[PDB]
Structures are given as C-alpha cells and as structure tokens.
C-alpha cells in the first residue's frame, strides 16, 4: 500500500453480450410512466401500443388472462401489469363532421 | 441405485377411447359468450390414447406433446423427465413435485435405465442454467383425484398446463365424462430441445404401490371452436375432424344449426406413386476409349 | 451426499512438481468454498491455502508462498493445487475441505470447514517405490470355537504407504482387522489383515486379497489355501 | 344434409360429380 | 489473469445503472454498444471475466 497510481489494484471485469436462438431473456431493467386515468391517452400494457380512454371496467376476468378482446379482432380491455385491475379502452372521441 | 421389486410379472401397453376432453386455452385472451376459431396443437376428440396402468415407465417419444391424464388416490406420480438423450451427453429436464414444492432444474443430468422416487433418479449432474422456485405445488373418500397436464414446445417455451377436478364416479380406469379446460399456471423459458418423454413415479415401499394410470396422447394441429362463456370460461369445443356434422359447425358457427344443406368441405382423392417416364438411353458417351485406353504420353 | 474425491498422490523425489486435483461431487461447484489443509501422522492439521466460491486466492501459509499455487476450475467441477520445490517437511495428508456458508456479497471473512475427505499420501523423499509382496497366510486347523481359525494376506516390501485391501469387490465390510504397517529400519512397511473365517465347507469368500498401490501400480490377485 | 341440432344429429353426406365409386349409398343425378 | 471467473447469468432483469454508483476513477468503455442503449438490446446470456 505505497505503490503509484499505475501499480494499485485494479478490479477488471469485461461482460459477454451473446444472442442466440432463445426466447425472451434479460432485456431492460422496467420502464413505468406512473399512469392517470382521466382522458384519452396513449397507453402501452407490455406490448398493446394502441390508442383509447381507460375507464376500468367492472368486468370479471381469470388469473391467467391478460388482455381481453370482444368480436372485434382488436383489443378493449386490458389487465394492469402492476394492480391487479381489469380496465377497459374504448376508443378515443371520433366521428364525422358536415356542414 | 437402480432396483426393481419382486411379483412384477407382465404389463403390456394397452389402449383406450378418450372423449371430449383436452381443450385448453391456446392464448391469454378473454372471450365473453362468443365463439372463437383457432389453429394449434390440440388432443383431437375420439382419439386413441395409452393405458398405462400404474399397477412398468417406459420412454415414450414428444413428438409435439402430451396429455398425461391421471386418477389416483394418493401422490405417487409427482415427477416427470424431459430429454433428447436422457443422459450426461446432451441437456435434459425434469420437474419434481415435492409435498410441499415444486422444483425445475435443467442441469446435465445422467439418468439410469429405470428412474424412480429423495434425489436417487440421477447419478452425476451437472451445470444448470435456469431454475425457478414454483411457491405453490402443481400435482377425502370416495371422491378420487383427476389431474391432467399438457405440455408443449413451439420455439422455446413450455407452457405447462393443468387442470385438477374431484371425479365422484369410480370407474374400470377410464377416462370420465363432461368438460374440461387446462388453465396455463407456468411458463418456462428453458428454451431445451426434447424429443422423449419419461416419468417419474414414487415406491414408498418401507410393497404399497396404490393404483393409477397415466394416459399420454399425442397432439396434433387441429382446428377448434371454442365456447367462451360469459366470464371467460369454457364450455363446450368441436373437433373439426369428426362426421361431416361437426364441419358444418366449423364453417357456419353455431351450435344450434338449422335445417338444410350446406358446403362445407371439398373432397379429393390424393395420389400414390412418383412415377416418372423418360426416353431409353442412347448413343453412349466416348467413356469406354478414354477411362479404358492403352497408352498415354506424358 | 457430498462426495469430495481427491487424485494425485505419491512418491515424489525432493525438487519436484505434482498436480493434486479434488472432484466435488453433490453439490454445486459455484458458491462453496474449498480449501487445502495437510495433516502431518500424528502432529495435528496445517492450512495450505484456499479459494473462494469464484475463482479468488484467500492467501496461503508463511511456509508455501512462493512454491504452491492453487487454482480453481468450475467448468469441471475441481480444484487443484501445483507444489513446486518439494522438501522434506511436506510429507502429510493434504486434505480438501469445503464451506459450509454460500458465501454471500456483503458480509464479513469468516471461512469454517464443513465436509471432508480421505486425503492423498504425499511422501516426498530421496527413496524409490518398491514392489508389494502378497502372501496366502495358512488356515491352521487350530478349531477350538467356531470362528477361531483366521487367514490373511503378508504384504511387505513397500515404501509409500497408499495400502487399500479388498476381499471379493470392495465389499464384505464385516469384521477385518487390518493391522496399520510399521517401518522395519529400511524404509518398507509391512501389511496385514484377519477375517472372520468360519468352518470352511465350501460356503465361505473365495479366499481373494487384492492390494492397490498406486507408486507401485499392479494388480495382485493371489488366491489363499489351507 | 341435416335435419338441425334440434331433433336429431344424424347427417347425410352428399358428395358432387362422384359416381359412387371414387369416394345406403344411391346415385342421384 | 490467467485463471478468471466466468459467471453465467440466467433469466433476469439487469439494471445498467448501479454500474457507476461505486467509488470515482473507474472506466466505463464500451465496444460496440452505448450505456444509454444498454438497456435497449435483448441478450440472452451474459458472461462476466473478472
Ligand atoms: C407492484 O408494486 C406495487 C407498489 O409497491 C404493489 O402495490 C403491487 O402489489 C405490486 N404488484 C405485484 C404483483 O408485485
Ligand atoms: C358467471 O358469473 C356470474 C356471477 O357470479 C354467474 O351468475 C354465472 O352463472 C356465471 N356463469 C358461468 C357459470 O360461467
Ligand atoms: C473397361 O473395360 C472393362 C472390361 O471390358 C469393363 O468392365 C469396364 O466397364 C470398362 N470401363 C469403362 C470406362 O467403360
């Protein structure tokens, strides 16, 4: 414990970043926006990037069960990742105007 | 070390006639009193499925899954065993249900010719790279137990799934009545390449092996129509494969069709030979005065 | 459970190098730490050095810096441990420990042992390996109580001492009494054994000694008659 | 050809330009 | 640096954020990726030489 500064300790360690044929591993740490539910938003539940106005609905849904869709071949209701929640997007305000 | 108990004197694999049950939820999707088509890997209805009665394990291949039906009064069954090889040469897998947990290692296990259940089913291991701790455990009177428990790989993934209900009616060893649907409970993203399919039953001789029977049957890319109910459950599904009945249903989806004709399906005898014609040979290639000369020159 | 094998060891001449090697067995390979620790006969224990559950140095003894080096392999699930300019004072039963802690980031050094092994006999001297010498001991027919008449093997003429006696298969693990060895004023040992031996009526072992030893490597497999 | 999931579940296949030899079975034009 | 660990790393959620939180004077090259795209890339296994 005298030597300089080019002969002290030095705790080295490199890191391997491999990508293989495998599913879904280590990827980013978390990332949350702290949501409001009072307008229409954007909204991104783990992969849904649509838009709608979240107005968690009193529906009833399964543990297992994520994201629910009605006959419409899109999605309009979604479970929150964090709260055990069952919400609802409907659609944003939208329409069409004459004169 | 591998042992084997006397009075074992014969049980050749027999077979059975598996009804309506096997349907499990292909996607984490919530479906409200509609009707809903999809195209994946499901136990066709009817089918024509094992009787392995556990009164014997051999290794039964994984083409593309299993159904693994079970009726027991205790808990004998509580392992499974998962592998190309099912030795120290390539990677292996094994889900051990303990009384109070379950346990997943994929570690380069070696089993030996007959595994049996304490940790005595594998003699060297080996590094594992994944492991999950499973909190909750997966597998009264005259009410038995049934469970069931289907397992699939697509790309990586295992997507256990399973379903446990008290059956109130004793029966020859035969598959009961009614509906049932598998609830997904865990993933795995394991990502191993199995070909075989091996269990794993428990003694507890101190011989008292109890009874049960485990029915593997292979599953096959079907084409079902679901009965979400109005919480999400399922009721009833079709086949698509059985009488031209239920072909109907698929392509005009209901179930109380009414009265008339209907297209349905296309019919077409397929082929069987390869045979192709061509010309005699002729006028052969100069191969006989070149390969088979006198006299070269340098 | 856990199974620490340990491999190398022998007659070695004053200057030389070794490989010692341990086999972990039953555990994982990846958050216990293993030590080595030689027992000199009957004058106590003496750490030689030590790794962590990562590949670390934990330092070695005020008699060994210098001339070991140990290191660490956890691909193959073994440590290892490179002696160089051997001398007389390490002649001893170099053991491998393991830890019982997992060893975990913030806590303090504090390094107990928890499972251990058999050893291997490093003898480090000027001598050579000679060859053993099994001999079938009569039966007498001395029969007074039932199993009073007892037979054995004479091995003799050995320097290292790495003696390990079967019967049939590495079995048979009733009453024998194998008698420890003692230097005759040259260096060699000397070796023995008494069984059981009930009435011999061609239901007894099939009269089998067979003596392991590795500086002096051959497979004796001499038969003993009355 | 079906009655309707109502009375019965009995069915009557009906192939198209078939002669009842390339598939009570009658031959109807 | 003959004999370096090689940890392997299973399914997790690595956050490259405590990284720079230990004593000053440290290093932070990187070769072919950013700290600011690190956690933008899916890996599935990582490997530490120490
Ligand atoms: C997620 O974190 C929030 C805030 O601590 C907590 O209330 C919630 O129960 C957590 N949910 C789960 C399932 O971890
Ligand atoms: C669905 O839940 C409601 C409210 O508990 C119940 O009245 C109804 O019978 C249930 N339907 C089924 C069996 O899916
Ligand atoms: C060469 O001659 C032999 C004997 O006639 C015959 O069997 C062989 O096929 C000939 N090879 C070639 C190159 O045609």
């Known amino acids: 414990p005298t030597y300089g500064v080019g002969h002290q300790p030095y705790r080295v360690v490199v890191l391997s970043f491999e990508l293989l044929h495998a599913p879904a591993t280590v990827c980013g740490p978390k990332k949350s926006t702290n949501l409001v539910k009072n307008k229409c938003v954007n909204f991104n539940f783990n992969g849904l990037k649509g838009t709608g106005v979240l107005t968690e609905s009193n529906k009833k849904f399964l543990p297992f069960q994520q994201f629910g869709r009605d006959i419409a071949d899109t999605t309009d209701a979604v479970r929150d990742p964090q709260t055990l929640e069952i919400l609802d997007i409907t659609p944003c305000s939208f329409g069409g105007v004459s004169v | 070390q591998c042992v084997n108990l006397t009075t074992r004197t014969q049980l050749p694999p027999a077979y059975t006639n598996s009804f309506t049950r096997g349907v499990y939820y292909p996607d984490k999707v919530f479906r409200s009193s509609v009707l809903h088509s999809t195209q994946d890997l499901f136990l066709p209805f009817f089918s024509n499925v094992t009787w392995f009665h556990v009164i014997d394990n051999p290794v039964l291949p994984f083409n593309d899954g299993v159904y693994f039906a079970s009726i027991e009064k205790s808990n004998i069954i509580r392992g499974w065993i998962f592998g190309t090889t099912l030795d120290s040469k390539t990677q292996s897998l094994l889900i051990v249900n303990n009384a109070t947990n379950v346990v997943i290692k994929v570690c380069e296990f070696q089993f030996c010719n007959d595994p049996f259940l304490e940790f005595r089913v594998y003699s060297s291991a080996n590094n594992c790279t994944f492991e999950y701790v499973s909190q909750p455990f997966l597998m009264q009177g005259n009410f038995k137990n049934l469970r069931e428990f289907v397992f699939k790989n697509i790309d990586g993934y295992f997507k256990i799934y399973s379903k446990h209900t008290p059956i109130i009616v004793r029966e020859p060893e035969d598959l009961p009545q009614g509906f049932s649907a598998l609830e997904p409970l865990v993933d795995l993203p394991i990502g191993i390449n199995i070909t075989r399919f091996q269990t794993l039953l428990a003694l507890h001789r101190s011989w008292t092996a109890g009874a049960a029977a485990y029915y593997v049957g292979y599953l096959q890319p079907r084409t079902f129509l679901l009965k979400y109910n109005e919480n999400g459950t399922i009721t009833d599904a079709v086949d698509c494969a059985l009488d031209p009945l239920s072909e109907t249903k698929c392509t005009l989806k209901s179930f109380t069709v009414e009265k008339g004709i209907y297209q349905t399906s296309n019919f077409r005898v397929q082929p069987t030979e390869s045979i192709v014609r061509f010309p005699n040979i002729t006028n052969l290639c100069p191969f006989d005065e070149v390969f088979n000369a006198t006299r070269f020159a340098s | 459970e856990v199974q620490l094998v340990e491999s190398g060891g022998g007659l070695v001449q004053p200057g030389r190098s070794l490989r010692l090697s341990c086999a972990a067995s039953?555990?994982?390979?990846?958050?216990?730490?293993i030590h080595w620790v030689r027992q000199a006969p009957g004058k106590g224990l003496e750490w030689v050095s030590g790794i962590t559950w990562n590949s670390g140095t934990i330092g070695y003894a005020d008699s060994v810096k210098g001339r070991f080096t140990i290191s660490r392999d956890n691909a193959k699930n073994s440590l290892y441990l490179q002696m160089n300019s051997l001398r007389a004072e390490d002649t001893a039963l170099y053991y491998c420990?393991?830890?019982?802690?997992?060893?975990?980031?913030?806590?303090?050094?504090?390094?107990?042992?928890?499972?251990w092994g058999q050893g291997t006999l490093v003898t480090v001297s000027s001598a050579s390996t000679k060859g053993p010498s099994v001999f079938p001991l009569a039966p007498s027919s001395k029969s007074t109580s039932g199993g009073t008449a007892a037979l054995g093997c004479l091995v003799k003429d050995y320097f290292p001492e790495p003696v390990t006696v079967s019967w049939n298969s590495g079995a048979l693990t009733s009453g024998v009494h194998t008698f420890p060895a003692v230097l005759q004023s040259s260096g060699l040992y000397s070796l023995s054994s008494v069984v059981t031996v009930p009435s011999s009526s061609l239901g007894t072992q099939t009269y089998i000694c067979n003596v392991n030893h590795k500086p002096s490597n051959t497979k004796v497999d001499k038969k003993v008659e009355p | 050809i079906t009655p309707g999931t109502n009375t019965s579940n009995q069915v009557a296949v009906l192939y198209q330009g078939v002669n009842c030899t390339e598939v009570n079975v009658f031959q109807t034009r | 640096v003959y004999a370096w660990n090689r940890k392997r790393i299973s399914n997790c959620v690595a956050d490259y954020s405590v990284l720079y939180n230990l004593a000053p004077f440290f290093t932070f090259k990187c070769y072919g990726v950013s700290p600011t795209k690190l956690n933008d890339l899916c890996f599935t296994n990582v490997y530490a030489d120490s």
């Open positions: 420990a393991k830890h019982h802690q997992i060893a975990v980031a913030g806590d303090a050094e504090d390094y107990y042992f928890d499972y």
């Open positions: 039953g555990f994982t390979f990846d958050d216990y730490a």
